[PDB]
Structure formats: structure tokens, C-alpha cells
Amino acid sequence: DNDPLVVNTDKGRIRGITVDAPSGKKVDVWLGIPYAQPPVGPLRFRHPRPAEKWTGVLNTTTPPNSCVQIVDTVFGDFPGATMWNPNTPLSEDCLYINVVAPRPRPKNAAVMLWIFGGGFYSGTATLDVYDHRALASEENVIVVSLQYRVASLGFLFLGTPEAPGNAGLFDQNLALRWVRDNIHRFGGDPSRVTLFGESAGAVSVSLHLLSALSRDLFQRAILQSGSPTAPWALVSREEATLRALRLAEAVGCPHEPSKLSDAVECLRGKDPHVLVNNEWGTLGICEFPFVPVVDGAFLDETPQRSLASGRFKKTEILTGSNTEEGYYFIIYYLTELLRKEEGVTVTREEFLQAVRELNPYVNGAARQAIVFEYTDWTEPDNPNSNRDALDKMVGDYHFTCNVNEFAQRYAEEGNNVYMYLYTHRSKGNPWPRWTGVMHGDEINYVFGEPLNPTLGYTEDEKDFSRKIMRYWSNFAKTGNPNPNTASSEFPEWPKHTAHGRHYLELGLNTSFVGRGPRLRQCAFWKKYLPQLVAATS
Amino acid sequence: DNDPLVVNTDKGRIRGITVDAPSGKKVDVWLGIPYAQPPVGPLRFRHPRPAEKWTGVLNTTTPPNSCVQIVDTVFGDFPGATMWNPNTPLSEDCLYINVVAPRPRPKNAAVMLWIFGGGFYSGTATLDVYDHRALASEENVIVVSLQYRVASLGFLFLGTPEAPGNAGLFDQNLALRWVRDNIHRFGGDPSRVTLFGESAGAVSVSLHLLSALSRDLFQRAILQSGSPTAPWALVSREEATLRALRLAEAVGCPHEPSKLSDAVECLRGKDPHVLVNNEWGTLGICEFPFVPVVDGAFLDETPQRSLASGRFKKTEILTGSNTEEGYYFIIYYLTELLRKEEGVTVTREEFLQAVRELNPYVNGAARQAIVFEYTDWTEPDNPNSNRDALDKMVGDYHFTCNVNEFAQRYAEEGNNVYMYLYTHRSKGNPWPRWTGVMHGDEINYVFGEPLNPTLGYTEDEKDFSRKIMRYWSNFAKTGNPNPNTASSEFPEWPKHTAHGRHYLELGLNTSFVGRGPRLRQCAFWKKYLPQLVAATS
Ligand SMILES: *[C@@H]1O[C@H](CO)[C@@H](O)[C@H](O)[C@H]1NC(C)=O
Ligand SMILES: *[C@@H]1O[C@H](CO)[C@@H](O)[C@H](O)[C@H]1NC(C)=O
Ligand SMILES: *[C@@H]1O[C@H](CO)[C@@H](O)[C@H](O)[C@H]1NC(C)=O
Ligand SMILES: *[C@@H]1O[C@H](CO)[C@@H](O)[C@H](O)[C@H]1NC(C)=O
Ligand code: NA
Ligand code: NA
Structure with missing residues (x-):
């Protein structure tokens, strides 16, 4: 096979497809590569197994299934609410990876891996807002995204081996090894993998910086509006069991803490959709029913203790918050x-x-x-x-401050940190004006959505998008966001230092640098x- | 007598003298006019009596005695400390008034009456820093100052009629009636008297706005860094007695609360200087041993209750604070x-x-x-x-905030208020740089000290002094500080309104207006x- 669009992975060969980016530039895509066996039946709630080797050529040409989750209707077919709605069929079999290489395909290049986040209850790699085509084509980087199990399907914990917890995180972990093992065939570097995410994406990416198991599976990290030290990031093992037994009760299964093997087996039987709909009890603002927990394998201690003791990968960090987090x-x-x-x-x-x-x-x-x-x-x-x-x-309590803490502990352990405050509200923002710049507004700009001609982004917004795409990209490359002009001295974006605590304002005509934000x-x-x-x- | 320098007051005639102002301009002065009998012997601690009518022509040509008080040595002959030191001989006989008319002497003009303040323990009208010559000559106003009894001599309270308290305030009150009765002969208007002071000066001026007795003895008020609602302004009648009996003990007199007439009579005997030196027990910062108290005559309630109920003269108020009050x-x-x-x-x-x-x-x-x-x-x-x-x-606690409170209550009772924040530090300020603009720095500028050629004030500082002298002066005239240019509309200095709470920054090149200050x-x-x-x- 001399075909550039067929690639031979460890578990067999796959066939890709050339697609036009909205900009008009051409990229090569591989969509829906299975990185694991479908976690169905006896395998539900459990850690993933690698995919069974396949014979012949497999078509990875179309966007894979999104994991079983709830959808947002509370605003009907509002464009602002529907952009986070899954755009593929919901299935328990959702464990796939998407790879997008630019054309011409480089021999060895940088890898940017996107971990989505839906508060650990939702989300998919297939969303329109996460489009690899614009990012890969413009910045010349191998863009990769993965699907990780979400909600109680991904994060149910009972302490039992039939439900050990952190299944979604072990999904991501396994997907990182797949990248390590298979990315060079797509023209990437297994050692130059930079993880980046938003909400739980950042909380996930951070947990890989901490975890013993996914330690050497990547190089750098970019974290958007999330840290492992956030209140909603983890649950106590004592509560996680109660949340599970409550879900058992609510669905009509044995909920007794005496016999745990009865509970999990009854749960394995129930339909996945009825299971994800019964997770929501009495919960305050910005707290979610099923999230990461300290299992003993992925994490053997709370992120607070890890940060305090200084047990995390010595790496460059690019992190930041938006101006109005809470509103959403x-x-x-x-x-x-x-x-x-x-x-x-x-x-x-x-x-x-x-x-x-x-x-x-x-x-x-x-x-x-x-x-x-x-x-x-x-x-x-x-x-x-x-x-x-x-x-x-x-x-501040749920987002901004927690980002600051993680960024400081990395800075004072002698690591290079780059902190941002994203202040830009789109002219075409569908939400009311008073909302301003909300949680997850920067995503459209980091993925190059304004470069789409079919969408009415102003000519300045298209420049701004290219700018922050550059910052993001060459950080994944060089460990530094600063462009070659002014990279030599007195950077546009100064390092977030332990005492200085500087940040860059990402906005339309502001290069302003402050200290914080919101100290x-x-x-x-x-x-x-x-x-x-x-x-x- | 056709002589312009002799004036016939109600209690007899006095002879003045023409003096050159440091600027070179000529003014007429009457210095050391007795407004009361000397409060010596049986009259100590008691309310003042009007002066005994005198025969013939009396010379009021030289600065009168300063009242018995302590002096500041703690910095030796430092120019910064010695400017507040009394520059005349200390006497129990100190009850005098000083009148300064500009030349040519107007038929009927505005009256500005300066009440000095030394935390109610010190001060004199004769200080170099309070010089009427520059103010009267440049702004064409009759400038008047008075001496009021200070320390325990002025503010001792035992509830007994031999020591009823507020003697210093009744001194001022009597001096205000003298002005009402005698100022037209010097070319002033008895109804256009505007009171102005600093520290206790402001606290005194404010207490005249409150008091039933001195209600109709003046027109307007200017208050510098002081209000009646300040912590150090008044003492409880229960404490004032204890402070008195402690002073009785410390001086070696009967201190028993049983027999009060024994205590006061023993006190009347003791030398005035040993009496003022034994006032200082255990006192925190910004609190003074002998101050005004609610006596029943001058004030029949606490200033807090007066302000709350809205019992104060309906008048224009010009008040303000300096940037660094506490430092001093x-x-x-x-x-x-x-x-x-x-x-x-x-x-x-x-x-x-x-x-x-x-x-x-x-x-x-x-x-x-x-x-x-x-x-x-x-x-x-x-x-x-x-x-x-x-x-x-x-x-903030001891000064700035208390000024804000008084200014607000006046504003929301439908009165015109003008709030300032004085931000200017002299180039020739003798105190260390870090001190900045301290308590009582504006005094030099309101009195026209920079207009003195023998002192090295910069040419801009001389303009600034004339500016705030103007603000002060035409407020005493018109009830408004704004100059005729821009007085018609959109003032330089906006009104301090109940909700708006605006202030003017008094500085060298700033006309900046804020809201507060320090809300x-x-x-x-x-x-x-x-x-x-x-x-x-
Ligand atoms: C994928 O393969 C199917 C046959 O299984 C074929 O019908 C389809 O055209 C292919 N699509 C691609 C690779 O674009
Ligand atoms: C930044 O602000 C505006 C943006 O419209 C513009 O005047 C210019 O680009 C910059 N100039 C300023 C703040 O004076
Ligand atoms: C004040 O009167 C005295 C006489 O008692 C006289 O010696 C002195 O020159 C006069 N000073 C004045 C009024 O300038
Ligand atoms: C106020 O500031 C300075 C004072 O030295 C001077 O440049 C000018 O008078 C004003 N201008 C400003 C702030 O640009
Ligand atoms: Na979230
Ligand atoms: Na004082």
C-alpha cells in the first residue's frame, strides 16, 4: 500500500478521507478510530480494554458516536444551547479517536490533543465548535480528539472492582497510549503531544499531569477555565458510593450498602438513557453528580495533597479564565x-x-x-x-480562583506558566448582552471558527482568532506562545511567575498585561x- | 474721632494698626481685643463672663496670649513640629479676638471666622500658619480669629455648676456674639459670618451648627478634616467625671466621687501648667483627655442623635479630608x-x-x-x-469617614454640600516623603502662605494657594466655591449630593472629580x- 490515506495501526489498517476546511484549505481526516472494545454488557462501569485486532481495511471516514448523556432542551432550539448538544447518535459504544493531519502531511510534527468537557456529564469530540480542520490547516499541527465515557457510565464509584471509578479517565489514558503508539504513522511526534481542554477538559488534562499512569504519555498542557483543585472536580469516596446507591434506588435496583455486587449487576441491566437521567438529586450550583474520584490507581491521593507536596509533571502550562464565568x-x-x-x-x-x-x-x-x-x-x-x-x-469560587492556584503552584515549582484573561465577546454572540464573555467563549476562537466564510465574524475577529490559534499552537511546539518577533526579548505575553503572577489580556485591541487576575x-x-x-x- | 484705626466697641474703644501683608499689600489689624473677663481664680473651669466695660482708648496692636497648654518637644526644634508650638506667652488670661480688615476697608463685607484646633488640648489664634494678612488682602474679606480655653481648663466636666463642661465651646459662643455685635464697625456683615476650622476647629464649627445657643450667630460653615461624629470629638459624661477625678488624684487633690465641691476647689488652687501636664493617662491613638461633652446647655444630646433626627442649621457646607490623615x-x-x-x-x-x-x-x-x-x-x-x-x-476611622457621614446627612436634608479631597504635598514639606499629604497640610494654602516671598514656594504652588483661597472665600460670600466663569453651568466643583456623593480633587494640575472619597x-x-x-x- 503506497496510498497516503490508508494507515496501518497496531490493531489493523484504516482508510481516511481528504476534506476541505471551511477556509478552503485541504486536510486529511481519520474519523471514528476505535481505541478500545465497546464497554457494553459486563464491561459497563469498568476500565476499558484495548480494541480487538481487525482484519482487512476499516473505514474511518465519518464522525463516531457520542457517549450516552442527557441533552439540553431547557431553551429549545436556541443556537446558544444547541451548540453543546451532541450532533451524532448517542451510543454506549462511543470509544473512538479522531485524527486530522494537514496537507502536505509533515514527516514529524507537533500533536495537539483536545479533551472536551461537559461537567463530566456530557460532551462529544464531534461538536461543530471543536473543528480540527481550521486549526490543523492554519497552524500546521496534527489535531487529535477523543471520546471518553461520561456521567454515571464513566464515573460511577462503589469501591468494588465491578465499579472502581474513573472509567472516563482510564478511557482518556488508554487513548493517550494509542496516540503514543500510532501517531507517527499520521506524521506526528509521540513525545510532542500537548493536551488541551475546557471545563472538565482542563480538569481532565490536569489530572493527567498528576496521575502516575498517564505521566509519560504526553509533553505539555493547555488548560481552559478549569483546574484539579476546583470544588466540582472531585467527590469523596464516601459520597461517590452514596451517589451510586441513590442512583440504584432511583432506578429501582438494590441500594443496600451491605450487598454491593447486587447493585452493580442490576445497574448493568438497566437502559443507559434511564440511568443517566436519574443522576440529578439535590445539588447546588456548579456541582455535578458523577465526576472523578481518587480511585487508588489513576490517583492515589487528592489533587490538593499532590499540589501541596509538589507531585506533578515538571512542564510548561498555558492556562486562563474568562471574565464572566458564573453567568452560564x-x-x-x-x-x-x-x-x-x-x-x-x-x-x-x-x-x-x-x-x-x-x-x-x-x-x-x-x-x-x-x-x-x-x-x-x-x-x-x-x-x-x-x-x-x-x-x-x-x-471566582468555582472557576477563576482555582485556575490561579494551580497556575501558582506550577510557577513556584520552577515551571514556566502562561496565564491569560480572555475578555473578548463576539459581535455575533447569540446570548444576551449582559452575559458578556461567558464560560467557554474562547473555544470558537482557538479552533478557527471565525475563519469560516459561511459565518459572519468581523474581519478583526478573524485576525484575533488567528492570533490566539498562534499562541496556542507554538506553545504546543516550543513551550512558549510568543511569536518569533518579540520572542527574543520583552515578550508580548510574560511568564506567570510565582511572585509576579502576570497575565495577558486576550482581547481585540488590548495587549494589556496585569497581575492576577482578581487576586x-x-x-x-x-x-x-x-x-x-x-x-x- | 474721625480716625479709621480707632473703633468704638460696645465695651469701649480700641486702637488698631496698619501692617504690610507678606505680599506687600496693606491691611488694618486689631490684635488682642478682650471678648471676656479673664477666667482666673473662682472663674476657672466655669463659663465665661463678658468683658468689663473700659474707659479711654485701649491698644489692640499686638498678638494676645495663647491659652495654657502643653508644648511639643518630642522632635526638638524641628520646623515641622515647632509650627504648631504657641508663639506667644502662655497665660490663663487668653480670651481675646483678632480682627483683620483689608484696605480699603469695605462698608459691608463677608466675614470669615477661623477657629483653630489642637485636639482640644492645644493651639492658638496667633500661629504664623494662620495669618489673616494674606487671606484678607487677596480675597477682600474681614478675617477674624478667636482664642478659646483648651485642655482641662477648657473642657473639665464634673456635672457640678463649678465645673459644668464645654467652657471652651462657651468661650467660642461668646466670641460669636461679640462678632455679631461689633463686626459692622470694622466693615463686616453680622449676618454673613462664615465659620471655618481644622481638627477640633471643624469639630467646634460643627458643634455650632448643632448647638441651640450659637445657632443664629453665623451664616455658613467650612470644615477641614473633622466632624462632630468622630470618635475623639466627645466623651461620655460618666467618663468625663472619671477623667476629672483621675486628674484630681494625679495632681494630689481629693478624688472622691462623694464630695465633688472639694475636688474643683483644690483644682482651682493648683498651678495651670501642672494641671495640663497630668491629663495624659492610658489613651489609645487619636483620643484626647479633655474634649467636648454633652452638657445640657450647649448640647442637650449626642451629635449622633442630632444628625439622625436632622436637628442642625439648614446651611451650605464646604468640607473635606486629606489623603494621608493617620500618619501624623x-x-x-x-x-x-x-x-x-x-x-x-x-x-x-x-x-x-x-x-x-x-x-x-x-x-x-x-x-x-x-x-x-x-x-x-x-x-x-x-x-x-x-x-x-x-x-x-x-x-479612615478617625477622620475621613466621619467627614463623609456629616457631609452626607447635610446633603440628604436638602442642603448644598461641597466635598474636597486635598491631595497636594508641598515641594518644601519638611517631613519625610512617605508621609505625603498629612493632617493639616491645606492650612498653609488656605491662608496664603505661598504668597510670602521670603518662603520658597514654587510659582505653581502660589497659583494653587490663590485658587483654594478663592474657593474658600467666595463660598463664604455666595454659598458656592465656583468662580463666575463656569459658575453659570457645569461647575468645576460639583455639589456633594446625597446619592452622587461627588468630591473635587484639590491638587496642582488635577481638576478630577470622583465620588467619595473612599466609600x-x-x-x-x-x-x-x-x-x-x-x-x-
Ligand atoms: C467507505 O467504505 C464504504 C464501503 O464499506 C464505501 O461505500 C464508502 O464509499 C467509503 N467511504 C469513504 C471511505 O469515503
Ligand atoms: C484601542 O481602542 C480602540 C479600539 O476601537 C482604538 O481607538 C485603538 O485601536 C486603540 N486606541 C485607544 C485605546 O486609544
Ligand atoms: C500703643 O500704645 C502705647 C502706649 O500705651 C504706645 O507706647 C505704643 O506706641 C502704641 N503702639 C501702637 C498703637 O502701635
Ligand atoms: C497633568 O500632568 C502633568 C503635570 O506636570 C502635565 O503633563 C500636564 O499639566 C497634565 N497632563 C497630563 C496628565 O497629561
Ligand atoms: Na462545566
Ligand atoms: Na487633632
Whole structure:
């Protein structure tokens, strides 16, 4: 076989297809490569097995199945909500990898591996917003994405070997070995693999930097709006079992903590869709039913202890937060107030209501410590301020501050860190204006969506997209985002240093550099508030 | 008598003298006019009596005696410390008024009455820094100053009629009636009297706006770095008696609360200087041994209740604070650290030490509420930040915030208010650089000291002085500081409105207008911290 579009992997040979990128540039794609046996029947909830070797030529020409998950309807066929909806058929057999090489195909090049994230309950590598064609063609990089098991199918934990937990993470781990073993045949470098993700993507990518098993399976990491030290990232093993036994109860299975083997076997029987729909009990804002847990194999300790002791891969890190993280989550949660319409506001009374509902676990000697910190004292009753104040307290505690912590611990262990604050809101953003730049807005720009002519992105937005695609790309290459011009000295993007803590503002005409972001509020949630709760309890 | 320099007051006639202002302009002065009988012997601690009518022509040609007080030596003959030292002989007979008319002498003009302040323990109208010659000549206003009894001689309270308290305030009150009765003969208007002062000066001027007795004795008020709602402004009647009986003990007199008439009579005997030296017991920063008290005559309620109920003269108010209030007081107090030298700094440890010593009455669940508010979280251990952070917490609690409160209550009662933040540090400032603009720095500029050729003020500083002299002067005239150009619309200096809370920055090239100043920290000390101390106690 002299055919460039057929490739012989360890488990057999596959046939790809040449496709046009929206830009018009040509790339080679391999879509739906099985990296594991379908985790069905006795294999559900369990760690994945490598794929059974196949005979003949297999067609990897079309986008694979998305894993079984819930879909978002709460806004009907709104373009803003439907972009995160799975665009392929939902199946238990979802374990596949997608490889996209640029044309001409390089002999040995950089590898960028995208781990999607849906709060560990949803998502797929097949989303339109994650399109490898624009990124691979413009930056000349091998772009790879994977499907990992999600929700209770991926993250159910009972301590038993029939449900050991972290199945989704072991999925990713196995997919990383596939890359290590098979990427050079697509023209990549097994040692130059750079992992990058958003939400759980970042939380996943981070957990590979920590994990013993996936330690030497990649080179660098890019983390978007997520860290392993976030509140929603992990659950206690004691709770994870209760969440599992509650799911057993809710679905009509044996829920007794006495006999665990009864519970898992009954669960294996039930339909996958009824299983994922019964995960949602009483949960506050920004907390999810089934997520990573410290299993003993993938992780043998909590990420907090790993970070403290300094047990993580010595690597360059590119990480950052968006300006308005919370808004997205305060829309779905707390849906009464702050609905999907233009010009919404919040009265001082409604604000005071919200901080109780958004922080239900604090003693009230902490509530007004929050309200004093998160109110604008130049004009306290301002309806705009009180609304934006909700986004900040959610955004900072659940997202922004946790990113800062991980970035600092990496910086002070002598690693090069690059911190960003993404401030750009699209002109064509479908969501209301007040939302501003929400959680996951940068994705469209890192993947080169503005370079699509069929979409009406302004000419400046197309430049901006190419700019951050460059930053991202040559970081995966060189360990540094700075372009060759000004790479020699006084960078556009300074290093996030332990004491300096600098970040770059990613916006349309701003090259502004600050320190943080939001160091005061981070000091609030990390230092002041915890010791106050101690002193009042 | 057709002589312009002789004037016939109600109690007899006086003879003045023409003097050159440092600028070279000529003014007429009357210095050391007795407005009351000397409060000596049986009259000590008591309310003043009007002066006994005199026969013939009296010479009021030289600066009168300063009241008995302590002097500052702690810095030896330092020019910065010695400017507040009394420059006339110290006497118990100190009750006099000074009148300065410009030449040519107007038929009927505006009256600006200066009440000095030394924390109610010191000060005199005769200080070089308060010179009427420059102000009167340049702004064409009748400038008047008075001497009021100070320290325990002025503010001793025992509830007894032999020591009823507020003697210093009744001194001022009597001096205001003298002005009402006698100023038209000097070419002033009895109804256009505008009171203005600094430190206790402002606290005094404010207490005239409140008091029933001195209500109709003036028109407007200008208040510099002081309000009646400040912590050090008043003492409880229960404490004032104890402070008096402690002073009785310390001087070797009967200190028993049983027999009060014994105590006062023994006190009347003792030398005035030994009496003023034994006032200082255990007192924290920015608190003074003998100050105004609610006597029942001058004030029948606490200023807090007066402000709340809205019982104060409906008038225009011009008030403001300086950028670094605390520094001056943290130098004399807490003298170990933060000494008088260039380039002093504060370590993070020393900072944490200070907040305990500077706030000795807070439970420690409040101490770190302060440290979190008053630390710079971009670089927390910064030695410059930690030093400046001490000035702010002292400046805000003891001065700046209290000025804001009084200014707001006047604004929301429908009165016109003009708030300033004085940001200008002299080039020739004798104190160390880090001190910046300290408590009482604006005085030199409001009195026209830069217009003195024998002093090396820059040509811009001379313009600045004339500018704020103008603001001050035509406020006393018109009720508005704005010059005729731009007085018609969109003022240089906007009104401090109840909701807007605007202030003007008084500096060299800044016409900048903000809102506050320092609304966050004021909300801290006024709203947040008090309810936190409640929740933790
Ligand atoms: C994939 O192979 C099928 C036959 O199984 C063929 O019908 C189809 O055209 C192929 N599509 C590709 C490789 O583009
Ligand atoms: C940045 O801001 C605007 C962007 O529209 C523009 O004037 C120019 O590119 C820059 N200039 C500024 C802030 O003066
Ligand atoms: C004040 O009067 C005295 C006489 O008592 C006289 O010696 C002195 O020159 C006068 N000074 C004045 C008014 O300038
Ligand atoms: C105010 O600042 C300086 C004062 O020296 C001067 O450039 C000018 O008067 C003003 N201009 C600015 C801030 O650009
Ligand atoms: Na998420
Ligand atoms: Na004072």
C-alpha cells in the first residue's frame, strides 16, 4: 500500500478521507478510530480494554458516536444551547479517536490533543465548535480528539472492582497510549503531544499531569477555565458510593450498602438513557453528580495533597479564565431571576436572596462577609452591579480562583506558566448582552471558527482568532506562545511567575498585561473566608 | 474721632494698626481685643463672663496670649513640629479676638471666622500658619480669629455648676456674639459670618451648627478634616467625671466621687501648667483627655442623635479630608516603628503587630477583617503597602469617614454640600516623603502662605494657594466655591449630593472629580465591621 490515506495501526489498517476546511484549505481526516472494545454488557462501569485486532481495511471516514448523556432542551432550539448538544447518535459504544493531519502531511510534527468537557456529564469530540480542520490547516499541527465515557457510565464509584471509578479517565489514558503508539504513522511526534481542554477538559488534562499512569504519555498542557483543585472536580469516596446507591434506588435496583455486587449487576441491566437521567438529586450550583474520584490507581491521593507536596509533571502550562464565568451556570440554576432576555437586572433585595441560594453551606457570618466583598460600595443598590456581582462570586469560587492556584503552584515549582484573561465577546454572540464573555467563549476562537466564510465574524475577529490559534499552537511546539518577533526579548505575553503572577489580556485591541487576575477575591475565598468560618464555628 | 484705626466697641474703644501683608499689600489689624473677663481664680473651669466695660482708648496692636497648654518637644526644634508650638506667652488670661480688615476697608463685607484646633488640648489664634494678612488682602474679606480655653481648663466636666463642661465651646459662643455685635464697625456683615476650622476647629464649627445657643450667630460653615461624629470629638459624661477625678488624684487633690465641691476647689488652687501636664493617662491613638461633652446647655444630646433626627442649621457646607490623615498621629503614637526619617517601611509582621495596637478594642475576629480590607492583595508583603495601610485605617476611622457621614446627612436634608479631597504635598514639606499629604497640610494654602516671598514656594504652588483661597472665600460670600466663569453651568466643583456623593480633587494640575472619597472603607467601618463585631459577640 503506497496510498497516503490508508494507515496501518497496531490493531489493523484504516482508510481516511481528504476534506476541505471551511477556509478552503485541504486536510486529511481519520474519523471514528476505535481505541478500545465497546464497554457494553459486563464491561459497563469498568476500565476499558484495548480494541480487538481487525482484519482487512476499516473505514474511518465519518464522525463516531457520542457517549450516552442527557441533552439540553431547557431553551429549545436556541443556537446558544444547541451548540453543546451532541450532533451524532448517542451510543454506549462511543470509544473512538479522531485524527486530522494537514496537507502536505509533515514527516514529524507537533500533536495537539483536545479533551472536551461537559461537567463530566456530557460532551462529544464531534461538536461543530471543536473543528480540527481550521486549526490543523492554519497552524500546521496534527489535531487529535477523543471520546471518553461520561456521567454515571464513566464515573460511577462503589469501591468494588465491578465499579472502581474513573472509567472516563482510564478511557482518556488508554487513548493517550494509542496516540503514543500510532501517531507517527499520521506524521506526528509521540513525545510532542500537548493536551488541551475546557471545563472538565482542563480538569481532565490536569489530572493527567498528576496521575502516575498517564505521566509519560504526553509533553505539555493547555488548560481552559478549569483546574484539579476546583470544588466540582472531585467527590469523596464516601459520597461517590452514596451517589451510586441513590442512583440504584432511583432506578429501582438494590441500594443496600451491605450487598454491593447486587447493585452493580442490576445497574448493568438497566437502559443507559434511564440511568443517566436519574443522576440529578439535590445539588447546588456548579456541582455535578458523577465526576472523578481518587480511585487508588489513576490517583492515589487528592489533587490538593499532590499540589501541596509538589507531585506533578515538571512542564510548561498555558492556562486562563474568562471574565464572566458564573453567568452560564446562574442561568440554568436560579432560573426564576436572571432569565434569558435582554437588559435583565437585579434589585438589592434579590441580590441578598441569591448569595444565600448560591452559597447554601456558609454560616451567615460568612454571607455578609461575601456581600460586603461582592457589593459595589460606590453605588451599592445599582441593579447592574448586583447582577454582575453574582457572576463574580460564582465565577471566582468555582472557576477563576482555582485556575490561579494551580497556575501558582506550577510557577513556584520552577515551571514556566502562561496565564491569560480572555475578555473578548463576539459581535455575533447569540446570548444576551449582559452575559458578556461567558464560560467557554474562547473555544470558537482557538479552533478557527471565525475563519469560516459561511459565518459572519468581523474581519478583526478573524485576525484575533488567528492570533490566539498562534499562541496556542507554538506553545504546543516550543513551550512558549510568543511569536518569533518579540520572542527574543520583552515578550508580548510574560511568564506567570510565582511572585509576579502576570497575565495577558486576550482581547481585540488590548495587549494589556496585569497581575492576577482578581487576586483580592481569590485571597478572599482561599485565605480570609475559610479562617472566618473557623472563628465563627 | 474721625480716625479709621480707632473703633468704638460696645465695651469701649480700641486702637488698631496698619501692617504690610507678606505680599506687600496693606491691611488694618486689631490684635488682642478682650471678648471676656479673664477666667482666673473662682472663674476657672466655669463659663465665661463678658468683658468689663473700659474707659479711654485701649491698644489692640499686638498678638494676645495663647491659652495654657502643653508644648511639643518630642522632635526638638524641628520646623515641622515647632509650627504648631504657641508663639506667644502662655497665660490663663487668653480670651481675646483678632480682627483683620483689608484696605480699603469695605462698608459691608463677608466675614470669615477661623477657629483653630489642637485636639482640644492645644493651639492658638496667633500661629504664623494662620495669618489673616494674606487671606484678607487677596480675597477682600474681614478675617477674624478667636482664642478659646483648651485642655482641662477648657473642657473639665464634673456635672457640678463649678465645673459644668464645654467652657471652651462657651468661650467660642461668646466670641460669636461679640462678632455679631461689633463686626459692622470694622466693615463686616453680622449676618454673613462664615465659620471655618481644622481638627477640633471643624469639630467646634460643627458643634455650632448643632448647638441651640450659637445657632443664629453665623451664616455658613467650612470644615477641614473633622466632624462632630468622630470618635475623639466627645466623651461620655460618666467618663468625663472619671477623667476629672483621675486628674484630681494625679495632681494630689481629693478624688472622691462623694464630695465633688472639694475636688474643683483644690483644682482651682493648683498651678495651670501642672494641671495640663497630668491629663495624659492610658489613651489609645487619636483620643484626647479633655474634649467636648454633652452638657445640657450647649448640647442637650449626642451629635449622633442630632444628625439622625436632622436637628442642625439648614446651611451650605464646604468640607473635606486629606489623603494621608493617620500618619501624623501614628508618628507620635507608636513611635518605635515608623520614625521620623526618609525611606521608612513596614514588614508584614510589623503590620500585623500594629493593627492590634491601633485597634485595641476589637475582638480579633475583627482584626483580620481589618487586615484583609487594609492589605494590598496584589503584593501583600510589600513594605510600602503595609506602611501606607496603617495611615489609611487610622485616617479612615478617625477622620475621613466621619467627614463623609456629616457631609452626607447635610446633603440628604436638602442642603448644598461641597466635598474636597486635598491631595497636594508641598515641594518644601519638611517631613519625610512617605508621609505625603498629612493632617493639616491645606492650612498653609488656605491662608496664603505661598504668597510670602521670603518662603520658597514654587510659582505653581502660589497659583494653587490663590485658587483654594478663592474657593474658600467666595463660598463664604455666595454659598458656592465656583468662580463666575463656569459658575453659570457645569461647575468645576460639583455639589456633594446625597446619592452622587461627588468630591473635587484639590491638587496642582488635577481638576478630577470622583465620588467619595473612599466609600468602600467607610462602608467597612460604618456598616460591615460593627455588625460583624455584633455577630462575634
Ligand atoms: C467507505 O467504505 C464504504 C464501503 O464499506 C464505501 O461505500 C464508502 O464509499 C467509503 N467511504 C469513504 C471511505 O469515503
Ligand atoms: C484601542 O481602542 C480602540 C479600539 O476601537 C482604538 O481607538 C485603538 O485601536 C486603540 N486606541 C485607544 C485605546 O486609544
Ligand atoms: C500703643 O500704645 C502705647 C502706649 O500705651 C504706645 O507706647 C505704643 O506706641 C502704641 N503702639 C501702637 C498703637 O502701635
Ligand atoms: C497633568 O500632568 C502633568 C503635570 O506636570 C502635565 O503633563 C500636564 O499639566 C497634565 N497632563 C497630563 C496628565 O497629561
Ligand atoms: Na462545566
Ligand atoms: Na487633632
